[PDB]
Design a protein around this ligand. Structure first.
Ligand SMILES: Nc1ncnc2c1ncn2CCOCCNC(=O)c1cc(-c2ccc(F)cc2)cc(O)c1O
Ligand SMILES: [K+]
Ligand SMILES: [Mg+2]
Length: 213
């Protein structure tokens, strides 16, 4: 019995099947009252909602799924026919994410890819029929934000206007990624100050819009 398994069971027993809003609410209730978990949370989740609504992306890539919280949060705002691809290297987390999406009724909109982003990113064009990404949500190992961004560019996966949205740029922090995008002529950045999920600790999201080479 793991924390992630307890979060999934709590959702299944305290949310309505096929209702993504009740799913997010049960996850946020559980993590506020019972056990903290590394889901994006409601404070950063609200900023993520505002960004999704502004861009209405047709194809989103998320790096790091955990329990499926951010996938549910993004997929519930996607337009009919829009898709989300989420890469999760932990197989136990990938199985929880799948079941979470299944319960929320969003399974048709999301594809969970169980594996390392550095291995999966180069397969996106040929195997997954991807041309370019409309948006990327970075929420995996913090030291992978910068190499995976550089890898997405190399693979031709970024277009003029691709929205990169990075969680935890303050806590645990992503200093090399943050310095790079803020210093590059190929990105237009915006910092969205917020709070670490379920905590009175300052955190933030960085939006970095790819401008081409
Ligand atoms: N395909 C892939 N390739 C490479 N890596 C991959 C992958 N797929 C998954 N992973 C690994 C991603 O799993 C964990 C990443 N998330 C976090 O580490 C995280 C940590 C905190 C936190 C913890 C403790 C504190 F005290 C304060 C804050 C908060 C957050 O919001 C976080 O997101
Ligand atoms: K999450
Ligand atoms: Mg995070």
């Amino acid at each position: 019995d793991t924390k992630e398994q307890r979060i999934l069971r709590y959702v299944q027993q305290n949310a309505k099947p096929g209702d993504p809003q009740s799913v997010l609410e049960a996850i946020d209730t559980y993590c506020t009252q019972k056990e903290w978990a590394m889901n994006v949370g409601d404070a950063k989740g609200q900023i993520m909602d505002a960004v999704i609504r502004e861009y209405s992306p047709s194809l989103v890539l998320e790096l790091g799924a955990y329990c499926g919280y951010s996938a549910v949060r993004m997929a519930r705002l996607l337009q009919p026919g829009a898709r989300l691809l989420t890469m999760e290297m932990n197989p136990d987390y990938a199985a929880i994410t799948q079941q979470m999406l299944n319960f929320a009724g969003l399974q048709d909109k999301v594809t969970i890819l169980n594996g390392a982003s550095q291995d999966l990113i180069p397969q996106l064009k040929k195997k997954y029929d991807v041309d370019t990404l409309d948006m990327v949500f970075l929420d995996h190992w913090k030291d992978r934000y910068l190499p995976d961004t550089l890898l997405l560019e190399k693979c031709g996966l970024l277009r003029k206007g691709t929205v990169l949205l990075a969680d935890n740029v303050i806590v645990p922090g992503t200093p090399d990624f943050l310095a790079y995008v803020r210093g590059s002529s190929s990105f237009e950045c915006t910092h969205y100050s917020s709070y670490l999920e379920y905590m009175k600790v300052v955190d933030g999201l960085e939006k970095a819009i790819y401008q081409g080479p």
